[PDB]
Design a protein around this ligand. Sequence first.
Ligand SMILES: C[C@]12O[C@H]1[C@H](O)c1c(cc(O)c3c1C(=O)c1cccc(O)c1-3)C2=O
Ligand SMILES: C[C@]12O[C@H]1[C@H](O)c1c(cc(O)c3c1C(=O)c1cccc(O)c1-3)C2=O
Ligand code: NA
Lengths: 293, 293
Amino acid sequence: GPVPSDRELARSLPGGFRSRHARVGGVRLHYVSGGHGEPLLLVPGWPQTWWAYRKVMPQLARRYHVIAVDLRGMGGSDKPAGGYDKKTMAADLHALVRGLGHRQVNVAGHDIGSMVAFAFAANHPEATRKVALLDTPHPDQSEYEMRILCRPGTGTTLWWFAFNQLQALPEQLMHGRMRHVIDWLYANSLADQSLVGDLDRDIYANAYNSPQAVRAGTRWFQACHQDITDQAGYGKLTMPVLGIGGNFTFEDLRNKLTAQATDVHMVRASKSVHYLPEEEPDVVAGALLDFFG
Amino acid sequence: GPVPSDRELARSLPGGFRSRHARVGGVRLHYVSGGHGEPLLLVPGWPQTWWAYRKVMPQLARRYHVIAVDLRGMGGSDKPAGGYDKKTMAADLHALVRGLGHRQVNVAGHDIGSMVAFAFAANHPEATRKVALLDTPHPDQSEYEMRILCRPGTGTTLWWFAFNQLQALPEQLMHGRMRHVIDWLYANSLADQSLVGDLDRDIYANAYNSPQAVRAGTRWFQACHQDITDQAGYGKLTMPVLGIGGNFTFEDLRNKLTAQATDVHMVRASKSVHYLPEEEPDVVAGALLDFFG
Ligand SMILES: C[C@]12O[C@H]1[C@H](O)c1c(cc(O)c3c1C(=O)c1cccc(O)c1-3)C2=O
Ligand SMILES: C[C@]12O[C@H]1[C@H](O)c1c(cc(O)c3c1C(=O)c1cccc(O)c1-3)C2=O
Ligand code: NA
């Protein structure tokens, strides 16, 4: 059944967060901001919303003016026909913080949002103070080397990477049924399932359960070829970079970031598989606070 | 019912085919047979049934006694807990044809059914007159080499190999919704969509639409590591082998069969992507008549 609105959710957090909207380049974005200090943009990924950062936002709000956004195609934000490449979505966020009167910001992103975080630093270095990448590197040529099958007992099948490439079938299969997808993902990541409760899962499922919302989600993934091409155009990132890697992705994240960025710092979230802000918020909040300063 | 019975479907075919059953080793298998002459076992794959051979069965029934089967886990056949490795499924079919009093049969299989067809020749050579593999080679180490992502225009996303590895999520997402799966597959293979009509698609969807049927289907794919292990133990087939390959699987199929078999013939289905019996039925019917003699 129904879940609380974004205003209800934002207000439920300590730190005085408010749910807001802003229109950038004709597209309306939802974000939740609060706290005081230098600006900190938080970007979530699939299939989640700004609410993915709930466990860390209050602590961060003590030091930063936190801006937690729904990406284009996500949650309360508009779901236009296109522009789901990370370069365009990063430009969205850039227009946003600039519209808010910020010349440069701290940026952290998770999952799809980490890609957007990287694209932001890549395309808008002057507006980028520091950037933190949570678990997920930007697409590059290595995306084409991902294997369909893992040998038994090794790693997790990244099935949704192939599946979300598809036209039509995803919304056809997943509409109304996104809670099952969320349950599968959490079942193959959380050390304790109670790390993300029923309500939290239902908030994501409700945001993604319509065919248009599923579809918008897939566009982030279908954009991968374009993202890969754009990535070839990026010079190395030279501002401070933070990579926070889960227990099984850490060394691959370190490799990619050290190759694509010149001032890289790494942190290992040893008790996490992927949903870092939810699996080890203590590590993410602490890492970001020490890193952004 | 939702669609015509297998009994109705069998009778609708010229050549006087009849739908039957038989129990082998506690597992009840459905098949449709007809015609006169030397026995010819026909094996379909995912997500199809014996009905996939409808366009060629009448032509073949004039020269061979055709036996078109639903595999274990498929269509009208039982769907037990296990035994979905291709070796076990081949033993099923061996027991079946021996129970019918045939010492040797010709064998042809497509898709998953082609793997079983190969396993049949491999494990029961004395019961194999000749064997034809339609498009799909038996699993080997190369399966761990399949790529999650294709460069644009470089081929189709083979997403279902990854997806069908999963526990629970496949039934949850696909039950009641297999028609959409079938449509996607046909949308990415048929040169003309009317090659497979609306009712035919619903016949397949109906066979697979319950959670148990989706699940049984995934077992064929989850057995892949075990199939790969079994393949390593096989000697070269020395009976006549025919490979019929689609325009894009041909050369891989030719490589594998020639390495695994000493008497190999190849045929190119130049206007087909994968569903050879439905896409180029005359080429298929014609090739089998020439090969089985
Ligand atoms: C872009 C994205 O594909 C999205 C997904 O959010 C993602 C990604 C990586 C994972 O390793 C990963 C996941 C994910 O949902 C997940 C669940 C369980 C285990 C696991 O390891 C993962 C990604 O970077
Ligand atoms: C075992 C199986 O995975 C099953 C599927 O039936 C299959 C297989 C190979 C394909 O290349 C292939 C398909 C398939 O449905 C399909 C549709 C569109 C393009 C295309 O190329 C394919 C297989 O071998
Ligand atoms: Na509010």
